[PDB]
């Protein structure tokens, strides 16, 4: 890694200790998905390892109002993870010390700002808030390195292996003995569920035919002769390699790098921890997720795993609705529409999973639509190959949403928009005209 | 390629291990004190850790009936003997609890064991000298609990030199099982000793297998070599220039073409070395009777324990150099069917065998003529005979010649065809050497 993205790692650590010695309760503010939760986890644990105290706040969004209210608070050091780079001068109205460990496009006399974009690395491909927070805490605690990779996996910075800064973290964790590697099947929750649910709940990497379908996973295993009601390590080795060769035919990306650390044994691999923490964040059950990062494992784990079961039944219900209804295709896009309450807060995820599964055509860009009273919430999702031909959903949605009075934006591969219910057809024709312009 | 017999006994062994692990009890590991023995215990220890079990290791130079007698007092319900056991099986069977023996030496004809699981390649039609070591046998006992230990099975293999033209048999089955599992990578490169930890001049000078005639065991010569051919002599192997690197590949291959070949790296041993560097670290630990350091390496300890392990290898290697220097000067005397070298020097007393072997690979001493290394030990003399496979093919068996010859003067001897030992009274040494000479001439 660059000496810049490392020398700033050291200023961050040195400021953390000048408050830890001064006996002060360090203030952690972070985001509410796997990257945000695990990042706070990294800082929390750094702080615990030196008998320090901390107070976490988990937000869906950072607003100037929250930062205004923060300026009333005693707490001498503020630690923003996975957010901060958008509101830096507003933050600088805060006094004390302040650390911002983000990785989003940037926009500080007492402010330490660490962000990969400022040191020539891609904050979308190579480093997440959890890794950035690790680089701020590396000289206090290196035992947190595996959690840095949970957040990375959380934000999907993994396609053909951890790249860049995250690779530097994996190999730093490997040398340090806290993170082991082995190639295996990457089924969801291999220690906690029997083989039929594990397969059915493997959403990434997808298994077309099997993923999100219980009877189909059961009948599959029945016919090929492996114990459908036993958990993955309890089978017979002759029954095991039927599975490796069979699942690799359906999707060969199923076999690959698995990441295990001893502290997460009997929960799962590192990408199982990304799953538990995301499910905790969707349920606004922050505390359970952070307790996992901190090492709590009695009934807090039991509650976390119950949350993931219920989130996963919803996703299945879910893809089932998509397999039956299907999508309508215009010229340069396809869309799917729901007024059903169950699919309102998952429309994005199921949209994405249905492309990976080839239920819906992954080449044609997909807009998922949830009615929200008199408006409609839009989650656009596509595949990298559609981006290479010229698609940018963020630009198309922002422009298209704006023109009817609605707000939209996001990335090239995934974008959102909110539009009035009465303008939906027109909007969909307008996103269709823009995407056709974008590609030919 | 692996017989269902050698895997079905692999399964009994595993299933007995779990009936004690579930019963909450501290499994007893007893193993030998070289790379195979140490790494084999490592394999079992790690199997046991992966299921939150506990273990207690004992590392011995030799297994004696006395130790086994004392073991019967212990308590520990399951005993796991690695790289030893097949010689003392009925004695072992006097032990109660359960017992696993993961060895690869010639079994003794009394295969008894009501509660004893005996796994040994010789009993399932494989060569325990060429194709499977204790570490691999121990892997076959633990394969259905943990496959992440597969690279350590190959350290022990390399430790006992089960590698000439690639891992054969069972060990090949392990390399390809490790490869599929993603824990062991392969690539062809120069096979220099300790490429990450030492600068190029010491790395060359410390490459004892494969040998580099001219360069191995000689610091100034390695230095002058690299000086003259224009490669940075004081930089470590990956820090050179690629144009400076392939001067090296083509130059070292002229001196010994076996230098280029299969290298084995596993991620857990990164920044220590390749798998045959781990064999080196562990042997050096065992020679120094420093057994918790070597096992800590197998278990993944890597702070000051690695620092201590590497300092032990530097000191063992300076000894070996001192060493071959003594042999390059002050050479061997040749009779008719053998040659010998003699030392009363304390430094060369516990390495005579190794330097004897390295000097044949280096062609300092003639590899065709069988070589006896001799250390005075007060009123006796310890003999380490060593030769090359081509001398075996013409009819040499050092074990038979030494046992018979040693015996006839009241001394003990034996071993294999390629390497043997003997202990004889100092006053009978010339006669003995004439007698080993007459026997080897008869043999060929
Ligand atoms: Mn993030
Ligand atoms: Mn986030
Ligand atoms: Mn052995
Ligand atoms: Mn041995």
TrEMBL record, chain B:
Q: Which residues bind Mn(2+) 2?
A: 34, 83
Residues forming the DDH domain are 27-141
Q: Which residues bind Mn(2+) 1?
A: 32, 34, 83
Q: Which Pfam families match?
A: DHH, DHHA1
Q: Does the keyword Cell inner membrane apply?
A: no
Residues annotated as binding Mn(2+) 3? 36, 83, 104, 160
Q: Enumerate the UniProt keywords alphabetically.
A: Metal-binding, Nucleotide-binding
Q: Per UniProt, where does CTP bind?
A: 34, 105, 129
Which parts of the sequence belong to the DHHA1 domain?
A: 339-440
Does Ion transport count among this protein's keywords?
Answer: no
Q: Which GO MF terms are attached to this record?
A: exonuclease activity; metal ion binding; nucleic acid binding; nucleotide binding
Name of this protein: Conserved protein
Source species of the chain: Methanothermobacter thermautotrophicus (strain ATCC 29096 / DSM 1053 / JCM 10044 / NBRC 100330 / Delta H)
């Amino acid at each position: 890694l660059p000496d810049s993205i490392l020398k700033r790692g050291a200023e961050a650590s040195k400021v953390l200790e000048e408050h830890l010695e001064r006996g002060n309760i360090i203030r952690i503010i972070s985001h509410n998905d796997a990257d945000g939760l695990s990042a706070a986890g990294v800082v929390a644990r750094a702080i615990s390892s030196m008998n320090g105290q901390f107070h976490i706040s988990i937000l869906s969004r950072l607003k100037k109002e929250f930062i205004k209210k923060l300026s009333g608070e005693k707490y001498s050091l503020f630690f923003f993870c996975d957010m901060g780079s958008a509101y830096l001068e507003e933050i600088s109205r805060l006094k004390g010390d302040v650390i911002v460990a983000d990785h989003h496009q940037p926009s500080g006399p007492h402010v330490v700002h660490i962000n990969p974009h400022l040191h020539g690395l891609d904050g979308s491909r190579d480093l997440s808030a959890s890794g950035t927070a690790y680089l701020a805490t590396r000289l206090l605690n290196r035992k947190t390195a595996p959690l840095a990779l949970v957040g990375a996996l959380g934000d999907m910075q993994y396609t053909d292996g951890f790249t860049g800064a995250n690779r530097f973290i994996m190999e730093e964790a490997v040398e340090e003995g806290v993170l082991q590697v082995h190639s295996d099947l990457k089924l969801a929750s291999r220690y906690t569920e029997p083989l039929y649910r594990s397969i059915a709940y493997t959403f990434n990497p997808a298994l077309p035919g099997l993923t999100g379908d219980m009877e189909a996973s059961m009948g599959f295993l029945e016919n090929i002769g492996v114990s459908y009601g036993v958990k993955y390590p309890d089978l017979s080795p002759e029954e095991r390699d039927v599975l490796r060769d069979e699942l690799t035919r359906i999707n060969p990306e199923i076999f690959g790098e698995v990441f295990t650390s001893r502290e997460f044994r009997n929960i799962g691999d590192l990408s199982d921890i990304a799953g538990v923490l995301d499910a905790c964040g969707k349920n606004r059950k922050y505390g359970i997720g952070i307790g996992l990062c901190l090492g709590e494992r009695e009934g807090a784990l039991d509650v976390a795993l119950e949350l993931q079961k219920n989130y996963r039944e919803e996703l299945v219900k879910g893809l089932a609705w998509i397999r039956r209804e299907g999508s309508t295709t215009l010229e340069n896009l396809q869309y799917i529409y729901s007024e059903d309450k169950a699919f309102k807060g998952i429309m994005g995820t199921i949209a994405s999973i249905s492309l990976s599964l080839k239920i819906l055509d992954p080449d044609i860009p997909l807009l998922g639509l949830s009615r929200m009273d008199q408006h409609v919430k839009v989650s656009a999702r596509t595949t990298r190959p559609a981006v290479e031909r010229g698609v940018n959903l963020g630009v198309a949605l922002r422009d298209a949403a704006a023109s009817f009075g609605g707000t939209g934006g996001g990335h090239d591969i995934a974008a959102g928009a909110m539009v009035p219910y009465r303008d939906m057809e027109s909007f969909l024709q307008l996103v269709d005209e823009i995407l056709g312009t974008q590609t030919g």
